[PDB]
Structure formats: C-alpha cells, structure tokens
Amino acid sequence: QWKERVNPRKKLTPELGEAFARMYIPQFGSDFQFAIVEGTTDADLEAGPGHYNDTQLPGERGNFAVAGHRVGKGAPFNDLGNLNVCDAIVVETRTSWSVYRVMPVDSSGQQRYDEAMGCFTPEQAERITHGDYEHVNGRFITTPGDVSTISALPETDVIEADPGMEGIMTMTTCHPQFSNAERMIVHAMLTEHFPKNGDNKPAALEEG
Numbered sequence: 001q002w003k004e005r006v007n008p009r010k011k012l013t014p015e016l017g018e019a020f021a022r023m024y025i026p027q028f029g030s031d032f033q034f035a036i037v038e039g040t041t042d043a044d045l046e047a048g049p050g051h052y053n054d055t056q057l058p059g060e061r062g063n064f065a066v067a068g069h070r071v072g073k074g075a076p077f078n079d080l081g082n083l084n085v086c087d088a089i090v091v092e093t094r095t096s097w098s099v100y101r102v103m104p105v106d107s108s109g110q111q112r113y114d115e116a117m118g119c120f121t122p123e124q125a126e127r128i129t130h131g132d133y134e135h136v137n138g139r140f141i142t143t144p145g146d147v148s149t150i151s152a153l154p155e156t157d158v159i160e161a162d163p164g165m166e167g168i169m170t171m172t173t174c175h176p177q178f179s180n181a182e183r184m185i186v187h188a189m190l191t192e193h194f195p196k197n198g199d200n201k202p203a204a205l206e207e208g
C-alpha cells in the first residue's frame with residue numbers, strides 16, 4: 001500500500017471567508033495571535049482581521065492589507081496606536097514565515113533615517129527617507145474613502161505590484177477609539193520572508 005507525502009502546502013488564492021494565515025505582535029505579548037481570514041465583510045471581521053481581497057499576500061512585493069475591529073472583547077486592533085517604529089509583526093502562512101516591521105512614525109529627514117536604520121537595511125532606510133517610500137508614514141488617521149492606503153505602493157496611484165517595490169503590510173481599523181467616523185492606518189515593511197519545513201520560526205517572535 002502507499003501513503004500521501006505531507007508538506008507545508010497552500011492554495012495560491014486563499015479561499016473566500018476562510019483563515020489562511022496567522023499574525024503575531026510580540027510587543028503585545030505571546031498570547032496575542034489572530035487568524036487572518038480572506039475578505040473584509042462584516043462576517044469576515046467577526047473573529048479577527050480580514051485580508052482585503054485585491055491586495056498582495058504575505059511576503060509579496062506590494063501591499064499586504066488587512067482590516068480588523070478595534071472595539072469588543074478580543075478585538076485585534078485596539079492597541080495599534082501603541083506600536084513603535086521597528087516593532088515586529090510576524091505573519092505565518094501554511095508555507096512561510098514573514099516578518100514586517102513598523103515604519104517610522106511622523107518623523108522625517110535625519111530622524112526618520114536613524115529610526116529606520118534600527119531594523120531595516122541601509123538600502124531600505126534610504127528608500128524610506130528619500131526614495132519611493134519617503135511619503136509613507138508608519139501610522140496616521142484618515143477618512144473611510146482613502147482607498148490608496150491599500151495600494152501596492154501605499155498612498156499613491158500605483159495599483160499593480162512591481163518588482164521594484166518593498167513588501168508592505170497595512171493594518172486598518174476604526175477611529176477614534178469608540179467611533180467608526182475615521183480610520184487608523186499602520187504600515188510596516190517586510191524584512192524577512194522564508195519557507196517552512198523545519199522548526200525554524202523567526203527570532204522576532206522572542207522579542208518584547
């Protein structure tokens with residue numbers, strides 16, 4: 001008789017409304033982990049973050065964007081305002097581990113560079129300070145119609161992923177704290193991405 005050979009494997013396009021990934025924020029403690037579902041309908045956002053369907057997936061150049069609730073028992077995104085630059089967001093899929101790091105917040109010029117140099121490559125730091133990512137704030141408040149926040153190159157008119165892009169991860173939630181009038185946006189940039197098969201999970205998980 002014969003047997004299936006099992007391996008870390010996943011569908012190319014996540015099944016609608018199903019969990020296809022898991023995210024961790026070590027700065028928020030080891031217990032902080034949420035499944036990510038495909039889709040951003042009310043039903044999808046019920047048990048945790050949902051992936052915006054037309055955006056990139058984890059580890060991809062472009063923008064991997066998710067929405068999540070802010071209020072409620074076990075809302076995933078109530079404390080995004082407490083993230084600091086270089087804080088890790090770890091994303092697991094069935095085949096891979098990705099580490100994103102929160103981009104510099106509100107700073108510009110020399111201070112932005114120095115902050116970026118804390119966890120990004122010197123090349124990424126330059127792009128963040130003076131290059132294609134100069135305009136991209138790690139956290140800000142915006143209006144519900146701000147659709148370019150989830151564009152492949154955030155807050156631009158570039159929608160198609162391109163090989164020259166960094167990997168971005170975007171988290172969106174309501175704002176202010178007990179309201180849905182506005183939206184909070186957080187951007188983090190990809191610093192690690194590698195396949196499973198082996199016990200090697202990112203060192204970033206041990207932080208905080």
Ligand SMILES: [Cl-]
Pocket residue numbers: 176177178179
């Ligand atoms: Cl409020």
